[PDB]
Amino acid sequence: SMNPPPPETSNPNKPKRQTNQLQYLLRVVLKTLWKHQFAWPFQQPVDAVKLNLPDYYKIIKTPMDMGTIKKRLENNYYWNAQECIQDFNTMFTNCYIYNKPGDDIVLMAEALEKLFLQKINELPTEE
Ligand SMILES: CC[C@@H]1C(=O)N(C)c2cnc(Nc3ccc(C(=O)N[C@H]4CC[C@H](N5CCN(CC6CC6)CC5)CC4)cc3OC)nc2N1C(C)C
């Protein structure tokens, strides 16, 4: 099996805007997670071919990763902060679907999610 194409990161047929929440999501949330020790498995789409995991995309039908999220933010792909937050949560949830609780990768994801939730609790105000 091939990899699927990666998630779309730009779309000129969607209106675009910058908001202080979206800016915060890039400059604080993404930045903070990205530089974490355990960020690396989540910085790009899962290359199931390289990892020789033919079952990964048989079960994960909404893949998501921070590389994609970062590009989406950089390309003003999101109109609402909640769209971006949903992408992070999808990424975490995917990990908790494919992998056994307590596995290495799950502990890693959990560490990131804790930091994620901490930064989101500090999200600035709408406008
Ligand atoms: C899939 C199931 C499960 C799961 O749920 N997730 C999310 C998951 C995700 N990922 C992995 N693995 C890997 C991930 C990544 C790599 C990599 O090579 N990463 C490299 C990417 C290129 C990097 N860079 C360095 C600087 N370059 C340019 C800068 C200098 C200018 C840019 C290029 C260096 C690091 C290797 C992996 O494994 C060998 N496993 C996963 N697991 C399991 C297998 C448990």
UniProtKB/Swiss-Prot annotation:
Positions bearing the site annotation: Acetylated histone binding: N99
Tissue: Ubiquitously expressed.
Domain Bromo: 17-123
Positions of disulphide bridges: none
Record PTM text: Phosphorylation by CK2 disrupt the intramolecular binding between the bromo domain 2 and the NPS region and promotes binding between the NPS and the BID regions, leading to activate the protein and promote binding to acetylated histones. In absence of phosphorylation, BRD4 does not localize to p53/TP53 target gene promoters, phosphorylation promoting recruitment to p53/TP53 target promoters.
Subcellular localization: Nucleus; Chromosome
Covalent link Glycyl lysine isopeptide (Lys-Gly) (interchain with G-Cter in SUMO2), residues: K58
Recorded coiled-coil stretches: none
Family: Belongs to the BET family.
Disorder cited: Cornelia de Lange syndrome 6: A form of Cornelia de Lange syndrome, a clinically heterogeneous developmental disorder associated with malformations affecting multiple systems. It is characterized by facial dysmorphisms, abnormal hands and feet, growth delay, cognitive retardation, hirsutism, gastroesophageal dysfunction and cardiac, ophthalmologic and genitourinary anomalies. CDLS6 inheritance is autosomal dominant.
Swiss-Prot/TrEMBL domain comment: The NET domain mediates interaction with a number of chromatin proteins involved in transcription regulation (NSD3, JMJD6, CHD4, GLTSCR1 and ATAD5).
Other observations noted: JQ1, a thieno-triazolo-1,4-diazepine derivative, and I-BET, a benzodiazepine derivative, have been tested on tumors with success. Treatment with GSK1210151A (I-BET151, a I-BET derivative) has strong effets on mixed lineage leukemia and promotes myeloid differentiation and leukemia stem-cell depletion.
Subunit: Interacts with p53/TP53; the interaction is direct. Interacts (via CTD region) with CDK9 and CCNT1, acting as an associated component of P-TEFb complex. Interacts with RELA (when acetylated at 'Lys-310'). Interacts (via NET domain) with NSD3, CHD4, BICRA and ATAD5. The interaction with BICRA bridges BRD4 to the GBAF complex. Interacts (via NET domain) with JMJD6 (via JmjC and N-terminal domains); the interaction is stronger in presence of ssRNA and recruits JMJD6 on distal enhancers. Interacts with NSD3. Interacts with NIPBL. (Microbial infection) Interacts with bovine papillomavirus type 1 regulatory protein E2. This interactions may serve for the tethering of viral genomes to host mitotic chromosomes allowing successful partitioning of the viral genome during cell division.
Function: Chromatin reader protein that recognizes and binds acetylated histones and plays a key role in transmission of epigenetic memory across cell divisions and transcription regulation. Remains associated with acetylated chromatin throughout the entire cell cycle and provides epigenetic memory for postmitotic G1 gene transcription by preserving acetylated chromatin status and maintaining high-order chromatin structure. During interphase, plays a key role in regulating the transcription of signal-inducible genes by associating with the P-TEFb complex and recruiting it to promoters.
Name of this protein: Bromodomain-containing protein 4
Source organism of the structure: Homo sapiens
Range within the parent protein: 44 to 168 of 1362
